[PDB]
């Protein structure tokens, strides 16, 4: 069960899997009796958006084909269309004032959490401070529902693609595939391209300097095809000058907001280095989502870009921390390296980027801490940390000397010299560790038998609660 | 024969299933057919030279382009500085240079281009009559059946990018690359065209578009950028979107054509289909619109840039009308035309009538036998004393009739009768074209043809096809 491994699965899965807008008057067992003419159905959901939409995973990719050879065009007055065909249907019923089967009712999967005001009553109604991180983890991560929709959305993407690409693939990375996704959180998603007889064969096509003008003349064009031809594309943004050339869109039937980006093969390591550590240890995972959703309550982050911390470098110096226990809680990348083989060799642009991926591989960890230290430690650590002196290094797991004048620099473990948290000032770093020592203070003194029963917050949801 | 729209779709089929193969320096045409062939039939091949020596191959079957497709790499030059677009445009090179184990026999290349006037003049001069003449001229301008194959190529090559999206398009040329008053060396214009189960009624979600002029513009505009950074082989890339009809223009290097791509004009389509009969009922009125527009070019009463110039297509309409004014007939009339049409070949479009017979069998030949002798210098005779003043061009009728409105030189658009197809010439052109006329028509009149054929001098096209 290596990252990869998973990856082609749940593409493959999602190869052959479709969205159908459900009608109003919606009867379950007549549309999968319906369905299933076409093929065996492995797994189904409903969802809410502005309507009742089903995803449908057919066991065979044939049943696609099948379903779509009895599919028509729609046909209006104005009459005016852009007929790609894709995987998204619109089922209505042929007499619909003659069906009264209205009381199914159907069984709605969630694509969102619930908000930090409904939560806050459930984390003070828990026994302890560990609990409360658990149950935020639960109502929080991804469902396996979600992680389908994902993985579709790049299936949609990929063969829109296909029309001008042939051999394209659009692979997800970031949160939605390094296990500390959280309902709601984006899409991002990178674009991907993969002798008898007496003659070397070759394709003419144009020679430009760089994979970046090619990169943003293909993302330019493709940019405009969903805005123009792709059906739910919407808020289509080109980005193209950024250090990492990018187009945002969000997409009407999965819900979600998306990145599409070309041939980041470094963010695809480090979103296998944090599948890693969360698979390692459920109290790394814990940890995270409470911290994020710590760092958001107090503004220390936000949607736009800035001069805040974002959620990935917030993620890496809680990565560190766990790097830092006595025994650490998870191995150090270098750790990680020496126990990789030729096949784990990756070697991209100059930088190294080879670790392990087999799981059994690594020891286990010896630690035995709870999370109710951790939290309380993480605060601590960090609040009294020296942050004009030291940078982060999750390679040696220490401590280092700054190689450039930088407020908080964290060491972007595979693209050496780079700082992934060069966007912060001192403002912010100086709100972060003002935010941290007054929740390290507020766990500390805190009388959690007494606030119980008081019915006040306590624990996590404490430290939840604007100061 | 066959019908014009029987030989478009074709002519695109046999596109459809043809690919264009830079070949090595060093070529060895036997092996390299030996080696296509392995991938299926070969129906026809040519090779033509642009910056190397480049060829045309047309499979038997559409498999075998998939077939070649497969076995053909990218170039790799940096890594991924290459747009990975995939089309029908190869290069081929030899694996081991070092490995030539035959004789080498040179290649027969066909032209793309007709020899220029001076080299022409000469020819003219050596042959026995006028008439002659004008079929020299013909025969050395007209197109060949290899430019045709490269014409019809382009327009797939740009079709292919369209069916990204529109997955039922066509790009169909029309104007004279197919209406068989091509030349070697003219443009390539080309159009965009987009043509009880169970319980649920089941559809495609598809996005919307706007109406007919903001979806061109844009369809266009993505086209454009698409041939523009896609290429391979585009160039010089314009997009004149807001034009009455909205247009892209671009060189192609591959095929050397020079190419204007638009939307939904079925009118210019129709227009070209006519001529296309007019031109195929008598060889005589290919050869007069040859000599006449090669005449035109000469004395600068043409150009290559639009303007208050005639235009070629507006000297072609008059050239029509001309032969329709004979005694007897060269030509039918338009409304003739109509008359013999059918259900069929009943067209309507936008509110105007465009209908008129496709099969040639149903038009009588014509009595009229006038040489071109007679009809040369009939056409400057003609239009030297024409009345511009009080009269226009009408080719339904065949007849001379009053002006609509104020225009100099006034032509009725057969199809959409409210226009004037050469509205764009001013006076001064008009005024020029006349003078060149009389002129052309006094040198045929008064030249002593003998006299001058001994004297190794111009005579007759000759005469009229160097400047005054
Ligand atoms: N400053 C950075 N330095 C190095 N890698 C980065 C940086 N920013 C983003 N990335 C990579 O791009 C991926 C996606 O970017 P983001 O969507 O912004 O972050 P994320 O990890 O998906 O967390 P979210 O979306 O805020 S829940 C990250 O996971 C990184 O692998
Ligand atoms: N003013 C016009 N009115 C009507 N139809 C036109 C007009 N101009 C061009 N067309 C159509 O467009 C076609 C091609 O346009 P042009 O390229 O300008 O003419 P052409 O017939 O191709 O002659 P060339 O290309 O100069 S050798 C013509 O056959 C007409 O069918
Ligand atoms: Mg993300």
């Known amino acids: 069960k290596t990252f990869t491994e998973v990856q082609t699965e749940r593409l493959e899965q999602a190869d052959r899997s479709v969205l159908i807008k459900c009608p109003s008057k919606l009867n379950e067992k007549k549309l999968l009796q319906y369905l299933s003419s076409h093929g065996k159905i492995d797994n189904y959901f409903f969802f809410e958006n502005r309507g009742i939409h089903a995803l449908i995973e057919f ?86 529902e979600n992680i389908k929709l994902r993985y579709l959305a790049c299936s949609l993407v990929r063969d829109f693609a296909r029309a001008y690409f042939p051999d394209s693939t659009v692979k997800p990375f970031g949160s939605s595939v390094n296990t500390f996704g959280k309902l709601g959180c984006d899409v991002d998603m990178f674009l991907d391209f993969h002798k008898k007889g007496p003659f070397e064969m070759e ?26 031809f792709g059906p739910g594309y919407s808020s289509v943004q080109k980005i193209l000058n950024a250090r990492c050339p990018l187009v945002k869109f969000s997409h009407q039937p999965t819900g979600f907001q998306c990145d599409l980006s070309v041939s980041n093969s470094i963010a695809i390591r480090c979103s296998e280095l944090l599948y890693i550590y969360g698979c390692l240890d459920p109290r790394v995972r814990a940890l995270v989502f409470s911290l994020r959703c710590w760092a958001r309550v ?25 790097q830092k226990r006595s025994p650490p809680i998870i191995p150090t990348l270098d750790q990680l390296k020496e126990l990789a083989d030729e096949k784990d060799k990756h070697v ?27 939290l309380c430690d993480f605060f601590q650590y960090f609040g009294n940390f020296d942050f004009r002196k030291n940078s982060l290094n999750l390679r040696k797991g220490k401590e280092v000397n700054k190689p450039e004048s930088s407020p908080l ?50 624990g996590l949801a404490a430290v939840l609660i604007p100061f």
């Open 298 to 322: 107090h503004g220390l982050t936000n949607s736009v870009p800035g001069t805040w911390i974002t959620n990935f470098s917030l993620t890496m110096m809680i990565m560190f921390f766990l």
């Open 409 to 458: 620099y964290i060491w972007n473990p595979f693209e050496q010299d780079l700082n992934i948290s060069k966007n912060v000032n001192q403002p912010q770093l100086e709100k972060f560790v003002a935010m941290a020592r007054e929740s390290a203070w507020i766990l500390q003194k805190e009388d959690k038998t007494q606030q119980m029963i008081n019915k006040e917050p306590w």
């Open 59 to 144: 066991s065979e990719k044939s049943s696609v084909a099948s379903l779509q050879a009895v599919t028509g065009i729609p046909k209006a007055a104005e009459h005016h269309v852009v007929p790609y065909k894709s995987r998204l249907f619109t089922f209505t019923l042929k007499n619909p004032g003659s069906q009264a089967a209205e009381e199914r009712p159907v069984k709605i999967s969630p694509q969102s959490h619930i908000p930090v005001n409904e939560l806050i009553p459930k984390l003070c109604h828990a026994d302890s401070i560990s609990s409360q991180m658990y149950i935020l983890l639960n109502e929080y991560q991804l469902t396996e």
């Open 348 to 374: 991209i642009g100059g930088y190294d980027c080879s670790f392990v991926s087999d799981l059994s591989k690594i020891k286990p960890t010896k630690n035995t801490e709870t999370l109710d230290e951790l």
């Open 203 to 228: 394709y003419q096509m144009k020679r430009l300097p760089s994979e970046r003008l090619a990169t943003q003349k293909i993302l330019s064009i493709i940019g405009d095809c969903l805005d123009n």
